[PDB]
Nucleic acid binder design. Structure first.
Lengths: 37, 141, 33, 97
RNA sequence: AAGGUAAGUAUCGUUCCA
């Protein structure tokens, strides 16, 4: 029973952030050779 | 990036789409400071003169013009939209999204390839054109 | 034309009769209309 | 009471997920009370692609299904439908499968 | 979970909204 609760404390901020981005008034969403040129 | 013409407010981009009939309007929505947007805003530099006959390139900062974010889904860092005679020309890539190129590429020939294909399919009067290359992978191996 | 202020009464988008698209449900904000 | 809290949170999460479903006003996706997302009619391809959710939404729905399963097992215990031994065995089966 | 939207032209219904 406890294992899924440690999984819960692990995933709580991920979902609390994804839902916050989703359920909000305003929504928000090979790179080194492009860096120094 | 900085060399290409820029649009500052919502009216200007709509006019730029409307003020042309015989070319294709290739608009790079995004942020010119983005590492992704700056990767392809130099490809669009290297071919701006070449495609002058059938393409005009305008740049738009979505923060400066927050009028098309919701309607055209401007939430990927970089977006490319093709317009012909005030009509968004859908293009079928290997990717699931068939309305935009939401990734910055590297080769100056493939972008001219895509622009010329869009022009060819738009003179006929289509709404969805088919790209030559398939972007369901990256051909890396 | 380039280098001109936006009209006061202009609708910022869709004034040219544009049609938006919804590729997926997650992307974008809520319709709220 | 804890079982009341579970029956409350199940309704709250079900309402959240139905709001997320009816966020773009796509009526061809329906969430049941067991947190299973089903189409009300056979999906045309345009509507199928138009109604798709990222891994985060599915993960939230499935963890809500897990907590709903636990709460409903406890309700079964409280309604005399199952024994305390049966409730414990069912809870162990839920948390082990 | 995807990488599987053909693009269109019609009348009709509805609804918010100006």
């Amino acid at each position: 029973w406890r294992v899924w609760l440690f999984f819960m404390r692990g995933i709580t901020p991920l979902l609390e952030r994804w839902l916050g981005n989703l359920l909000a008034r305003q929504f928000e969403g090979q790179r080194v050779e492009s860096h120094f040129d | 990036s900085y060399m290409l013409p820029h649009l500052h407010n919502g009216w200007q981009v709509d006019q730029a789409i409307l003020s042309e009939e015989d070319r294709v309007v290739v608009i790079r929505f995004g942020h010119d400071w983005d590492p992704t947007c700056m990767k392809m805003d130099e490809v669009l530099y290297s071919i701006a003169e070449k495609v002058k006959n059938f393409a005009v390139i305008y740049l738009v900062d979505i923060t400066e013009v927050p009028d098309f974010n919701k309607m055209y889904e401007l939430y990927d860092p970089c977006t490319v939209m093709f317009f012909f005679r005030n009509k968004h020309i859908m293009i079928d890539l290997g990717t699931g999204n068939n309305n935009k190129i939401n990734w910055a590429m590297e080769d100056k020939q493939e972008m001219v390839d895509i622009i010329e294909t869009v022009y060819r399919g738009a003179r006929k009067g289509r709404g969805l054109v088919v790209s030559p290359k398939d972007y369901s992978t990256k051909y890396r191996y | 034309f380039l280098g001109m202020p936006a009209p006061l009464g202009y609708v910022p988008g869709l004034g040219r009769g544009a049609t938006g698209f919804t590729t997926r449900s997650d992307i974008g904000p809520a319709r709220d209309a | 009471d804890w079982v009341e809290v579970g029956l409350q949170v199940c309704r709250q999460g079900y309402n959240m997920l139905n709001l997320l479903i009816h966020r773009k006003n796509l009526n061809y996706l329906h969430l049941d009370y067991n947190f299973n997302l089903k189409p009300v009619k056979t999906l045309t391809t345009k509507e199928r692609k138009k109604s798709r959710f990222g891994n985060a939404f599915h993960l939230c729905r499935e963890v809500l299904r897990l907590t709903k399963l636990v709460v409903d097992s406890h309700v079964q215990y409280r309604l005399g439908n199952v024994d305390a031994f049966q409730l414990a065995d069912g809870l162990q089966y839920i948390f082990a499968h």
